[PDB]
């Protein structure tokens, strides 16, 4: 009070000193049920693949691509990534996901990698240098043990032109050893650009169905369309917190209310265009919003000449969010409530006045 009034001796009265404010302690983040799961199931266990070179591409759109099902299973065999860190895939949003898939054998899993080129570097699907993604290759020897060794996934071999990153080597050009073109069926040094499958169940361990679904990522300037789910905290009530709901973000308490919103209605506003009601994302309960307690601090002093003990008056605040005596204008901390009525000496508000009487103590 002396610091604000710029003096050393003050007289009787109620002086304004400062303005206190309660700060939010914790933070609550609420997101609704995780719906619209990305259909990543059909990418692994489905109908047969077209061919090795004729691989099919499946783009990704706005969805919820959860990764807790890929690196948490045992049906796969290889999960070696190339700088992806699957432990943090739930907190990373991408825009371009390439769900390449084809059929290879057990010995061709090694030849398909950015660090090991060769047979699959210029004759079939090639991989770039960066290749932000993980290779998913599992042993498909569960029911792909048909008789006769059906060779329908014929991979094109001995091709001249090198294959491009994320492309297909579709070229019906016969193998020419360096002579005149035959333009026929295995003529003068001619070989049709096709190789024979047929990895029968009684052929070998290395020659087995090993359908691999190659997966990669790519970032662009477009907004994040594909990303994993988000987290959610526990609901708290009757406390000045900082809520972080789906669309709203602010501070204030979150108590119960008797208001009833329409099915489509989510938010809630007052006459002065201020947020005062919110709806729970997870459950169905209208949560009321009320700003936390603020206001100025006033002191009731009997004058530094007589004595030096003073009181404080937190104006407008309840006495639970701060001897103590709840008045109609705050909580007068530092005074006793006497029943005898006297003349008003120091005005406080709503009739209640203070004075320095008898052992000497501030009365209200």
């Amino acid at each position, epitope marked *: 009070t002396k610091c604000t009034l710029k003096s050393f001796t003050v007289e009787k009265g109620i002086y304004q000193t400062s303005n206190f404010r309660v700060q939010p302690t914790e933070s609550i983040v609420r997101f609704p049920n995780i719906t619209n799961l990305c259909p990543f199931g059909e990418v692994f266990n489905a109908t047969r693949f077209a061919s090795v070179y004729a691989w099919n591409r499946k783009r990704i759109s706005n969805c919820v691509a959860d990764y*807790s099902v890929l*690196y*948490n*299973s*045992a049906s796969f*065999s*290889t*999960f*070696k990534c190339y*700088g992806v*860190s*699957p*432990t943090k895939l739930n907190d990373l949003c991408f825009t371009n996901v390439y769900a390449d898939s084809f059929v290879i054998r057990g010995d061709e*899993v*090694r030849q398909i*990698a950015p*660090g*090991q080129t060769g047979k699959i570097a210029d004759y079939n699907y090639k991989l770039p240098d960066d290749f932000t993604g993980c290779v998913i290759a599992w*042993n498909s020897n569960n029911l792909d043990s048909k008789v006769g060794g059906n060779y329908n996934y014929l991979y094109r071999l001995f091709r001249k032109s090198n294959l491009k990153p994320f492309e297909r080597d579709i070229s019906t050009e016969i193998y020419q050893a360096g002579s005149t073109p035959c333009n026929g069926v295995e003529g003068f040094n001619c070989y049709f650009p096709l190789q024979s499958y047929g990895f029968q169940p009684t052929n070998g361990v290395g020659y087995q169905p090993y359908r691999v679904v190659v997966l990669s990522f790519e970032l662009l300037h477009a907004p994040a369309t594909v990303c994993g789910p988000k987290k959610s905290t526990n609901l708290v009530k009757n406390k000045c917190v900082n809520f972080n709901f789906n669309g709203l973000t602010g501070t204030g308490v979150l108590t119960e209310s008797n208001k009833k919103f329409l099915p489509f209605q989510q938010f809630g506003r007052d006459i002065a265009d201020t947020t005062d009601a919110v709806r729970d994302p997870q459950t169905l309960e209208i949560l009321d919003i009320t700003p936390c307690s603020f206001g100025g601090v006033s002191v009731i002093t009997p004058g530094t000449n007589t004595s030096n003990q003073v009181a404080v008056l937190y104006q407008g605040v309840n006495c639970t969010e701060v001897n103590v005596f709840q008045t109609r204008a705050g909580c007068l901390i530092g005074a006793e409530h006497v029943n005898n009525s006297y003349e008003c000496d120091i005005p406080i508000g709503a009739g209640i006045c203070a004075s320095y009487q008898t052992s000497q103590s501030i009365i209200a």
Partner: antibody
């Protein structure tokens, strides 16, 4: 924050066995796999067996396949490993460790159980 | 399938001495490679996992690479001091029958 403890055996004998219990506490024991790894005195490490979330699959190794029973109660957050017909080469210290993900390492290990067979 | 590893190794505080871990069948670039450290008289702890990367807490001196030449791996442990004299093991998921194969161990010591 994660501090795992385990006990339930100080001495065993051929024929009569017990059940090792690994108390799960600290972390969230509802989204992680479990597997046992034993260590023989003067040797390296050996993978005993694995276990799914609650009751999915119980993968065993071909060495102890048919004489070891693993279990896991996801309700009470406990890991039980019961033995039967203890052999002679099973003298090793067993460790309890949770699996971050099926293709990753073990985050937190246990403390060790001195289970030895001696006449 | 077995994981080969040198039995013992000893040197003086100074340059780094890597530890090799050569496989027997399959590919080394098909699964991750982890390195554990087992202090004598306590429980093992993870030092480096996904050798191309390294976790927190452990100093960055512990480094490791991948050698796809003959399906092997290397753990270039730099900064040889007294607080690093312990045992180390090799581990890599290779068994298609849901089997986790481990290494043999080492006896890396110092010269005092």
């Amino acid at each position: 924050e994660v501090q795992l403890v385990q006990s339930g055996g100080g001495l065993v004998q051929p024929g009569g066995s017990l059940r090792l219990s690994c108390a799960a506490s600290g972390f969230t024991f509802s989204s992680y796999w479990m597997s046992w790894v034993r260590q023989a005195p003067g040797k390296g490490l050996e993978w005993v067996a694995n276990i799914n979330q609650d009751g999915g699959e119980k993968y065993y190794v071909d060495s102890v396949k048919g004489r070891f029973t693993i279990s896991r109660d996801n309700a009470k957050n406990s890991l039980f490993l019961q033995m039967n017909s203890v052999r002679a080469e099973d003298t090793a210290v067993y460790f309890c460790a949770r699996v971050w993900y099926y293709y990753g390492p073990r985050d937190y290990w246990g403390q060790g159980t001195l289970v030895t067979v001696s006449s | 399938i077995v994981m080969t590893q040198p039995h013992s190794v000893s040197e003086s505080p100074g340059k780094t001495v890597t530890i090799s871990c050569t496989r027997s069948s399959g590919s080394i670039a098909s699964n991750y490679v982890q390195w554990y450290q087992q202090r004598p008289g306590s429980s093992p702890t993870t030092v480096i996992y996904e050798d191309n990367q390294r976790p927190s807490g452990v100093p960055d001196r512990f480094s490791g690479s991948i050698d796809s030449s003959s399906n092997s791996a290397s753990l270039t442990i730099s900064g040889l001091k007294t607080e690093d004299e312990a045992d180390y093991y090799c581990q890599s998921y290779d068994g298609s029958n849901h089997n986790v194969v481990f290494g043999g161990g080492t006896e890396l010591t110092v010269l005092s």
